[PDB]
Amino acid sequence: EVQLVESGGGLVQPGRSLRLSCAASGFTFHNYAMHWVRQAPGKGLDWVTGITWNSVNVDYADSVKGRFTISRDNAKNSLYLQMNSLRAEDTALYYCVKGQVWSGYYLTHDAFDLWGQGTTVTVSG
Amino acid sequence: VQLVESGGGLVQPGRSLRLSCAASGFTFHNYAMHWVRQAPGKGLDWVTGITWNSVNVDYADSVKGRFTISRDNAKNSLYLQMNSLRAEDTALYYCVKGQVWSGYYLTHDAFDLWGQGTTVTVSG
Amino acid sequence: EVQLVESGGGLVQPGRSLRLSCAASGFTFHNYAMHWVRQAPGKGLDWVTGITWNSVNVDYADSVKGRFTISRDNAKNSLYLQMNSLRAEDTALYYCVKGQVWSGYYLTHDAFDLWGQGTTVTVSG
Amino acid sequence: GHHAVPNGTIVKTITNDRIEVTNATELVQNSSIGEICGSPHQILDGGNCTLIDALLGDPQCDGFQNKEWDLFVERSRANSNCYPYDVPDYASLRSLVASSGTLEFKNESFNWTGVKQNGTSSACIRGSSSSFFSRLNWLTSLNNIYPAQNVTMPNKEQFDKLYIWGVHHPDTDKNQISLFAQSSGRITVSTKRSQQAVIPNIGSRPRIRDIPSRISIYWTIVKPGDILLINSTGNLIAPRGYFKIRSGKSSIMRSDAPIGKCKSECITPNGSIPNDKPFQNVNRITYGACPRYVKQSTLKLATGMRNVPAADLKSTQAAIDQINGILNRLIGKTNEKFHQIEKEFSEVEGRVQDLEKYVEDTKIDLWSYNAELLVALINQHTIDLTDSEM
Amino acid sequence: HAVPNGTIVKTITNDRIEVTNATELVQNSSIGEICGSPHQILDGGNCTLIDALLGDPQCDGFQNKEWDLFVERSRANSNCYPYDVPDYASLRSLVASSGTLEFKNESFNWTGVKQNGTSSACIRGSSSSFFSRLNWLTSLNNIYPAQNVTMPNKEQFDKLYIWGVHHPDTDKNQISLFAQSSGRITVSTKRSQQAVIPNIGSRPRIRDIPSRISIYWTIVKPGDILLINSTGNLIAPRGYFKIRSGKSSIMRSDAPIGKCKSECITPNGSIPNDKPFQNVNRITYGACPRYVKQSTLKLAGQAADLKSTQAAIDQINGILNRLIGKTNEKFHQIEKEFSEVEGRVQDLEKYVEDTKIDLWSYNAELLVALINQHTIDLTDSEM
Amino acid sequence: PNGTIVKTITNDRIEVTNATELVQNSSIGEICGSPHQILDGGNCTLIDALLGDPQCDGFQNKEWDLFVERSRANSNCYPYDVPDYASLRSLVASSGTLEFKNESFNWTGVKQNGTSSACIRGSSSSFFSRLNWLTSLNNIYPAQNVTMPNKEQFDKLYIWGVHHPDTDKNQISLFAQSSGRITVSTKRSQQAVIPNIGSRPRIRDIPSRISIYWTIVKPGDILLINSTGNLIAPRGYFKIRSGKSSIMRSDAPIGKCKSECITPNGSIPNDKPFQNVNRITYGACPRYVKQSTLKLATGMRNVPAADLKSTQAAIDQINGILNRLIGKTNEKFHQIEKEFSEVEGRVQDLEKYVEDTKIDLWSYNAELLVALINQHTIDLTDSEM
Amino acid sequence: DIVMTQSPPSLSATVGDRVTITCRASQSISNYLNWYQQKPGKAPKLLISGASSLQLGVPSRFSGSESGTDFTLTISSLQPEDCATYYCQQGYIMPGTFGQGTKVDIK
Amino acid sequence: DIVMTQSPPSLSATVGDRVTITCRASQSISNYLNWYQQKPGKAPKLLISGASSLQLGVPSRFSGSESGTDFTLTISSLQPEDCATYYCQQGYIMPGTFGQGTKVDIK
Amino acid sequence: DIVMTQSPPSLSATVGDRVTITCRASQSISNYLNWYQQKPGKAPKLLISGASSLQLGVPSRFSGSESGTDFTLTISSLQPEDCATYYCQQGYIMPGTFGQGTKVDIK
Ligand SMILES: *[C@@H]1O[C@H](CO)[C@@H](O[C@@H]2O[C@H](CO)[C@@H](O[C@@H]3O[C@H](CO[C@H]4O[C@H](CO[C@H]5O[C@H](CO)[C@@H](O)[C@H](O)[C@@H]5O)[C@@H](O)[C@H](O[C@H]5O[C@H](CO)[C@@H](O)[C@H](O)[C@@H]5O)[C@@H]4O)[C@@H](O)[C@H](O[C@H]4O[C@H](CO)[C@@H](O)[C@H](O[C@H]5O[C@H](CO)[C@@H](O)[C@H](O)[C@@H]5O)[C@@H]4O)[C@@H]3O)[C@H](O)[C@H]2NC(C)=O)[C@H](O)[C@H]1NC(C)=O
Ligand SMILES: *[C@@H]1O[C@H](CO)[C@@H](O[C@@H]2O[C@H](CO)[C@@H](O[C@@H]3O[C@H](CO[C@H]4O[C@H](CO)[C@@H](O)[C@H](O)[C@@H]4O)[C@@H](O)[C@H](O[C@H]4O[C@H](CO)[C@@H](O)[C@H](O)[C@@H]4O)[C@@H]3O)[C@H](O)[C@H]2NC(C)=O)[C@H](O)[C@H]1NC(C)=O
Ligand SMILES: *[C@@H]1O[C@H](CO)[C@@H](O[C@@H]2O[C@H](CO)[C@@H](O[C@@H]3O[C@H](CO)[C@@H](O)[C@H](O)[C@@H]3O)[C@H](O)[C@H]2NC(C)=O)[C@H](O)[C@H]1NC(C)=O
């Protein structure tokens, strides 16, 4: 059916970089906007980044500005996240999220209709 | 489709009578019903009429105060009661039916069904 | 098969008379106007006479104004031309042409949609 | 020497914006009485009821049968308690019946071969039994057979006749077969000058009083010497007779004011208003000998003279005569208008409604400009003439 | 100076004042003839505009004729196949403002059909006929194949096409005319489409016909293409008319046409346009005075002083020159008289006309009062 | 020295010292957008933005106070026709906003999100972003009976459509049934539509068309959609509001200036009471008069000094007149259309008649007002001396 | 009450001829006039209601018209079955005002 | 009355080439111009009427146009069968006037 | 940068009772609020979008309403399957602002 599978993650030392991948299967990928969200262990849900189809409007959160990069590949049906500089505040479970509007130029006025079972990223010695 | 009548006869002046009209073949609780009397070889006269809801009831001037008209929709019947009869009321009575399907008032209509009258004679 | 057939041509002396007849077959005759057009040997095309379906508006050319008569018979499906006085300038091939407008009152706003192989008229000694 | 007043009033002229005078009159009326009292006019209170419901014969509107009027008052609590229906041109029929001014109904004996007549529904309850509209006939198949109808009625009288008929729109095909014995019906009502052909549409609709079907109402006008022909094959709501169309003064108003007892000639939805003054500020909707509408709260005409704080009779009489002549020319002479266009809309429709609003706004602006200029001119010339008497 | 025979006029501060001359500013009479020198008038005796456009026999002499004002008479009737126009007013206004009937033939394909059908109620001469600008298409050998014709617009002006749909009385008639039980017509361009389905049913007989014809019109722009794809009940076109923008209009009037020169036409007749206002009719053509609802409006030893007299005469004549003579030209406007009951649009039109008449009457009264007051003031100031 | 000629009632030409102009004859060719929210719809009509054009995507979920339509606007997707185009355009323009809210309709056994080659969104074929082309799935098109209530506190606008295919083969291939029918109803209105097969001229290699319809659902109401075939479903609902908003056709650049009165030629100042530029205006604008010059006598008559009190009195009176006339303007936001590209008939004639009546009446009023004020100004300035 | 007047108290006509009966009313009734036919020894039968609307079953030779504030009932071919007494009635106000009858005989 | 002038009195073209013939009128004719083709020894045949309306049976390579004030007849792909004389005629006002023909030959 | 406030932080109810969760926003979001339900150890599932639109597959016992300036999510008949954490999220401005959690426990 419809699913989003996330790969990557694990244990990384502070100041190092790694790349997470999200593969979508079951829907037209070049129509819906895609987001990355994260949840700390037993704390809450925090928005991370978001991109649209055609990759014109890209938005990041204030705490992840300048060190994070999100990209798309509509031919290969993939959403990529690259994190370069990492701190201990990013140890979380990451979810790859699908949007609801069928074709949205802008990233707002939307809702999260599909979520994926995220991957664990730990930043520790 | 007929309106039959009963109750006619010979009564002395100053006494009472009760005529009954029974309707069959049509929906009774829609049409207005009147009574019309005809003297022997004289003409036709109007005496009273009633609507489907028994809200508007009208009487002729010469029969005011002594004549009562009533209706029972469940039993499909129309009743007339005479109390103080005189020699001017010896006539043949017709139980007539109105034409409008559902009239709130007794006016603006005609008489589309007539019964075969019953005879009322007031004499010694 | 829609056709017009002409008859009555020949050789006549100057100052004498002639009568040409045109028979129409294959179309409703009382709906179309009818004209006569003559062509000199090796020269251009010239308009001669014209009539309508009701024989109400009849028009003639300037050079044949007085001595030419055109008539129509709807019952017999015929168009007749009568020439009273003939000169040497009238030796030509005559075409009996039909009009294009269906039930036209006037002769003007139309075109000649059917032509007949005309007959030869020679006015010489 | 002139006279002065301890009090004062402020008026507007052309050269001056504020002039103190001795006496000023108000040319605009800002208040009403709150009661629509029909002494000179005939007013019909359509409580519980609209005009179309009274026309069709709603069980609640049964008391409006064969009743004439000069103004129809339609209230905001009016509802429907019968079979659900729609009118494809509601405003046109409402205006036509409102301007006719009469609900007189005369029965006719249509032929109607081989059908079941006087169909009743449980959505309409008259008394304690299921019923239907009193001026329409629901034609239903008899013995699972609905023969084609072809009936004619000529107009041998000396007036136009209005016929109100309808088309039944069922919900499902099963209902259509059970009611009219045919998969698809078709209605053709024609005269010598017009034709109306209607095809019913089958589909579900939201339930009003447990009824998923609807009824579409149509009307026809038959002129003298014409014939009305009805050639339906199914889904016909036949007429039981004809109404009378008249030309005269009559209209319909939407208001919520009580009806009283007074001789007022001008009616507005707020209430009855006196017509002595030439202008008004209450409502755009009027009926009968009404002052014109302006958007000004106050418009005062200087019926006096300027003040700067024995007797002569000839000059005083001359000034009084001229001022009273001006007042006679202005105050009292009012034109009468019956059955204007609608000025309030409860929906949004589009081009026609925008055109109507534009027309009314243009009228209001032009008349406001006229009122301001007229008061300024009259005040200027009044001051000039009263200063010319010295 | 004084006069023995005076006149009575109205000012702002005076209602009845006596003056000397008191000319008149409203016209209350007409000569009773529709003069035709400046404008081109077309008398449609026994002929409506739509009948002339379609080409019924009685109007055969109106084809290919231009006009500036079409005159329709009350005796006009139709003597051909019964027909109905679903939007009669719009088509009448369109053709009236176009100002020309000019037909150019076109050669449509029309495969496998019988053309030029005739009816016994449209007699032209002594034989049955039909409209001269429409083509009644009927089945041939009990077959009516589908039509797929197309015509492009390679010219420099819009083309008007008039076509129709036949509504027969019974199914037997429909089959006998067009082989299909139910027909359907689709006429479309690059910007608009029109789909029509005939309605079978009986109608009152006009000239022994229970069937009818519904008339529709399309307009094709200079870069468009007209497509006709009907498979039944089609009264095909025979060509296209020319649509122009001009100063033409229509008028209903039972008045004779004479040889005279005048610029302002009303249904009662032609009226002079010197005075600024009128009282005859609200329907006008050309340079006409405004309509007011008032019967009359009027505007003002021994020696002599030439200078003062000349000054007063000059000022009064300047006022008169400003008022008298300068009129405005309105050619095509909305309808002001109706012979039916319609509804919203008719009420809106009546409201518009009443508003205009009331406002112009108020303007006329105020203007005459103002000018009289100032005329009296200035003539009193010169003495 | 220099003089100005003005017009009164008694005299047609009087030489006065100073005279002002009450008619604006010029405009800066820029639609200033400082105090009004102006949305430039380049290459995009209002209806093409209400629906989802592949080139009008940037206008979605946008608000405006005035919409500017350009003459170069064109459509670049599936051909469509609106049976009442003017009404829908006016309704959406006066609504003042496009805000789509998605809804989850209960469509059964059908193929959704159908695309076409007319719309191209970047590289792939597509369709409108606010509609839903429902076709058949596995050669079956089950009947759709879908309900949606209005539990909110504002009216909801639904835009749906019908599909008109070229031939019967195309209809059967798209929808299994030979003839479809659509019924969209509420508790107070109903619309039943039947498609019409037939060939049409090809726009972007398509002989089919789409008809567009709209429905308004009030609070406490319910929208029912019952369709057997040929339905272009909606993806959600728009929001209808009442306010000040309109739509204009103007080929003028948008600038950073500030001005209140807009016109298709540009933004014009509103100090003077009248104008001569265009009959189509937005906001607090001067009235339209056919005249080109209307001059008010702001000075005394001209014939070829310690009296300060008389000078002050005259100046105060004239300045009071000017204050009454100059600067006080009325605000009209949404009006009727005043330009037509096609010939239609009765309603267009009625609109033209209404505008002509308004223009003539206001021109007469302007001329009379200038005449009276000139006459009284000259009279008072003569009386002061 | 509104008195009703019928013109011919008795009329005789040949079979096939034309018979006309006229009625007048004291006040104005909005065409609410009904015609009744009574054979000897039987109940009345309504012929025309509304002065112009023919009831079902009545032969087409009976016609009703309004002319000059008078109401007319016309028989075009007087068959022998049309010998009866003809009465007029109103319905506008309700005191009940059947008029006197017109008796028709056949030669 | 109205004199018609044809621009080329004689034209020669190769098979497949484009050929244009022009006609001018003295007065204004409301696009009522008809083109006629006559082979030697046969009767004339009407090609286009109204300057833009092709008649049935005429090949599509013939086109007619109004180039402002001149009337043009264009043959796109000339063929050996298109060797004849071409005339332009008016219909506005009688008498009908034919212009002198244009003779076309094949190289 | 909107601060979403939720109430109550923790709730307890019996099987069958009525449960209400309220959410407020710092600024005015034009009815763009989404409700999310997360069970322990699973991904969030969207319940209501637009504050009034139920997504497909969500039981009808869930309702969303706009009570004044607050947004309410109501469970009419709580069931043992409805023990989770609920969040309210905005969509007007781009930075997604999830609220805190309302943990619901059955008795
Ligand atoms: C109703 O009234 C209207 C007017 O209002 C009438 O319409 C006019 O009809 C005229 C004929 O009466 C016609 O003029 C002739 O046109 C043809 C051209 O051929 C084309 O037409 C034929 C006929 O079928 C079509 O027309 C009839 C008309 O009723 C329709 O019913 C039918 O459905 C068709 O629409 C077609 O057979 C022919 O097809 C061939 O060409 C096409 C390509 O164009 C191919 O696809 C197809 O396979 C065929 O090859 C054409 O469509 C000419 O025949 C004719 O000119 C000749 O006329 C006669 C013989 O008919 C004869 O004198 C000469 O013929 C010879 O001419 C040349 C010299 O030898 C040479 O080509 C041959 O030898 C040829 O045999 C003469 O030249 C006419 O020009 C008008 O065009 C038409 N006008 C309009 C405006 O439509 C209509 O008839 C009336 N109908 C009735 C029922 O009363
Ligand atoms: C196409 O889709 C529409 C919309 O979904 C369907 O229309 C609905 O049809 C059903 C019946 O099939 C209607 O339900 C009935 O409504 C009546 C009103 O009573 C209830 O009203 C509302 C609910 O509608 C509530 O307040 C409450 O439940 C009321 O009782 C009654 O006539 C019916 O009685 C039943 O009521 C309850 C409900 O189970 C039971 O206790 C009773 O014993 C009894 O069974 C029933 O509720 C519903 O109202 C329709 N909706 C609308 C909007 O009209 C169409 O049926 C569907 N299909 C087709 C072919 O059109
Ligand atoms: C208009 O009214 C007339 C009244 O006669 C209707 O005509 C009748 O139509 C019915 C239904 O089609 C016909 O019945 C059927 O007709 C054919 C044989 O003709 C056949 O299918 C069946 O055996 C059956 O009889 C009926 O014959 C026909 N009557 C006449 C006299 O023509 C007509 O249908 C009505 N039109 C509309 C639009 O309602």
Chain E, nearest residue to C102 by Cα: E132
User: Residue for token digits 């012929």?
Assistant: G47
Three-state secondary-structure class, residue E313: helix
- Tell me whether residues F57 and A101 touch, CB distance under 8 A: no
**CA atoms of G25 and G88, how far apart (whole Å):** 10
**CA atoms of B6 and I18, how far apart (whole Å):** 70
Contacts of I87 (CB under 8 A, 6+ apart): A45, I6, I35, I36, I38, I44, I98, I99, I100, I101
Elucidation technique: cryo-EM
Q: What is each CA distance from F115 to A53, D123, F121, in whole angstroms?
A: 17, 46, 11
The torsion angle over the Cα atoms of residues E46, E51, E52 and E57, rounded to 10 degrees, is -70
Query: Which residues on D lie below 8 Å from G30 (Cβ)?
Result: 104
**CA atoms of F251 and F30, how far apart (whole Å):** 9
Q: Cis peptide leading into E272, omega within 30 of 0?
A: no
Classify the phi-psi angles of F24: left when phi > 0, otherwise alpha if psi is within -120 to 50, otherwise beta. Answer: beta
Q: What is each CA distance from G89 to B43, B58, G51, I57, in whole angstroms?
A: 12, 17, 10, 73
Phi and psi at residue E51, to the nearest 5°: -65, -40
The answer to whether the beta carbons of residues F258 and F268 sit under 8 Å apart is no
Query: Which residues on B lie below 8 Å from G101 (Cβ)?
Result: 43
- Tell me whether residues H30 and E105 touch, CB distance under 8 A: no
Contacts of F257 (CB under 8 A, 6+ apart): F28, F30, F32, F34, F267
Using the mean position of ligand 1's atoms as its centre, give its distance from the Cα of residue H55 in Å: 9
Contacts of F79 (CB under 8 A, 6+ apart): F118, F200, F203, F204, F206, F208, F209, F210
CA D123 to chain centre: 29
Percentage helix, strand, coil for chain D under 3-state DSSP, each rounded to 5: 20, 25, 50
Shortest distance, CA A50 to any CA of chain I (angstroms): 9
Q: Which chains touch C (3 or more CB pairs under 8 A)?
A: E, H
| Residue H45 bridge partners (DSSP) | H37
The answer to whether the beta carbons of residues D24 and D303 sit under 8 Å apart is yes
**CA atoms of B119 and D223, how far apart (whole Å):** 48
DSSP run (H or E) holding E322: helix E306-323
Q: Which chains touch A (3 or more CB pairs under 8 A)?
A: F, I
- Tell me whether residues D373 and F369 touch, CB distance under 8 A: yes
Q: How many beta carbons lie within 10 A of that of residue H96, not counting itself?
A: 28
Q: How many beta carbons lie within 10 A of that of residue D386, not counting itself?
A: 20
Tokens of F222: 């319910």
Query: Which residues on D lie below 8 Å from B104 (Cβ)?
Result: 62-63, 65
Pairing outcome for strands D279-280 and D28-29: parallel
Atom of ligand 1 nearest to the CA of E105: 86
Q: Which chains touch H (3 or more CB pairs under 8 A)?
A: C, E
Residues of A at the F interface (Cβ-Cβ below 8 Å)? 28, 30-31, 54, 100-106, 108-109, 111
- Tell me whether residues A106 and F126 touch, CB distance under 8 A: no
The answer to whether the beta carbons of residues D266 and D286 sit under 8 Å apart is yes
Q: Output the CA torsion sign for A53, A59, A64, A65.
A: positive
Taking chain A, what is the end-to-end CA distance rounded to the nearest angstrom?
40
| Residue B24 bridge partners (DSSP) | B2
Length, in residues, of chain I: 107
| Structural domains in chain D, sorted by start | 9-33+264-388 (3.90.20.10), 43-252 (3.90.209.20)
The answer to whether the beta carbons of residues C18 and C121 sit under 8 Å apart is yes
Tokens of F77: 């997707």
In chain H, residues 2-31 whose CB comes closer than 8 Å to chain C: none
Find which of F7, F8, F10 to mutate to test the E interface (most E CBs within 10 Å of its CB).
F10
The tally of domains found in chain H comes to: 1
| Residue F41 bridge partners (DSSP) | F69
Contacts of E229 (CB under 8 A, 6+ apart): E146, E147, E148, E185, E186, E187, E188, F198, F199
| Residue C20 bridge partners (DSSP) | C81
Contacts of F211 (CB under 8 A, 6+ apart): F80, F81, F82, F83, F161, F162, F164, F193
The answer to whether the beta carbons of residues B33 and B22 sit under 8 Å apart is no
Q: What is each CA distance from F326 to D18, D375, F322, H23, in whole angstroms?
A: 18, 20, 6, 64
The torsion angle over the Cα atoms of residues H31, H34, H35 and H40, rounded to 10 degrees, is -160
Cα radius of gyration rounded to whole Å, chain C: 14
**CA atoms of G60 and D109, how far apart (whole Å):** 13
Query: Which residues on H lie below 8 Å from C98 (Cβ)?
Result: none
Which of F115, F107, F96, F105 minimizes the C-alpha distance to F50? Answer: F96
**CA atoms of I104 and I81, how far apart (whole Å):** 11
The answer to whether the beta carbons of residues F24 and F272 sit under 8 Å apart is yes
- CA neighbours closer than 13 Å in the CB half-sphere of residue D118: 11
| Residue F135 bridge partners (DSSP) | F111
The answer to whether the beta carbons of residues E89 and E335 sit under 8 Å apart is yes
The answer to whether the beta carbons of residues E314 and E306 sit under 8 Å apart is no
Tokens of C76: 């017999």
Query: Which residues on D lie below 8 Å from F181 (Cβ)?
Result: 201-203
Q: How many beta carbons lie within 10 A of that of residue I30, not counting itself?
A: 14
SS (H, E, C) F314-369: HHHHHHHHHHHHCCCCCEECCCCCCCCCCCCCHHHHHHHHHHHHHHHHHHHHHHHH
The answer to whether the beta carbons of residues A40 and A52 sit under 8 Å apart is no
Length, in residues, of chain D: 390
CATH number, domain of H50, equals 2.60.40.10
**CA atoms of F19 and E382, how far apart (whole Å):** 27
| Structural domains in chain B, sorted by start | 2-122 (2.60.40.10)
Query: Which residues on D lie below 8 Å from F376 (Cβ)?
Result: 14-15, 380
**Burial group, residue I1, by CB count within 10 angstroms (0-12, 13-18, 19+):** exposed
The answer to whether the beta carbons of residues E213 and E82 sit under 8 Å apart is yes
User: In this complex, is the C-beta atom of E352 within 8 Å of any C-beta atom belonging to chain F?
Assistant: yes
**Is the Cβ atom of F203 under 6 angstroms away from ligand 2?**
no
| Residue D305 bridge partners (DSSP) | none
Three-state secondary-structure class, residue D368: helix
The answer to whether the beta carbons of residues I54 and F104 sit under 8 Å apart is yes
**CA atoms of C57 and H52, how far apart (whole Å):** 28
Best mutation site among D113, D146, D150, D230 for ligand 3 pocket (most ligand atoms within 8 Å of CB):
D150
Q: Cis peptide leading into G95, omega within 30 of 0?
A: no
Residues of the domain holding H61 = 4-106
Contacts of F328 (CB under 8 A, 6+ apart): none
**CA atoms of E55 and E131, how far apart (whole Å):** 5
The CA angle F309-F312-F317, to the nearest 5 degrees, is 125
**CA atoms of D261 and B94, how far apart (whole Å):** 45
Shortest distance, CA G107 to any CA of chain D (angstroms): 33
The answer to whether the beta carbons of residues G75 and G61 sit under 8 Å apart is yes
Which of H22, H24, H20, H21 minimizes the C-alpha distance to H4? Answer: H24
User: Residue for token digits 């509504």?
Assistant: E167
- Tell me whether residues H89 and C111 touch, CB distance under 8 A: yes
Resolution in angstroms comes to 3.0
- Tell me whether residues E105 and H65 touch, CB distance under 8 A: no
The answer to whether the beta carbons of residues I104 and I84 sit under 8 Å apart is yes
Q: What is each CA distance from E25 to E75, F263, I7, I8, I27, in whole angstroms?
A: 35, 39, 82, 85, 68
Best mutation site among E167, E169, E170, E174 for ligand 3 pocket (most ligand atoms within 8 Å of CB):
E170
**CA atoms of E115 and E113, how far apart (whole Å):** 6
The CA angle C119-C124-C125, to the nearest 5 degrees, is 140
Order across the sheet with A18-25: list the strands.
A3-7, A18-25, A78-83, A68-73
The CA angle E139-E142-E146, to the nearest 5 degrees, is 55
**CA atoms of E339 and E89, how far apart (whole Å):** 12
Chain F, nearest residue to E220 by Cα: F342
Which of F275, F247, F251 minimizes the C-alpha distance to F264? Answer: F251
Which of F241, F225, F236, F379 minimizes the C-alpha distance to F314? Answer: F379
Tokens of D23: 């006496």
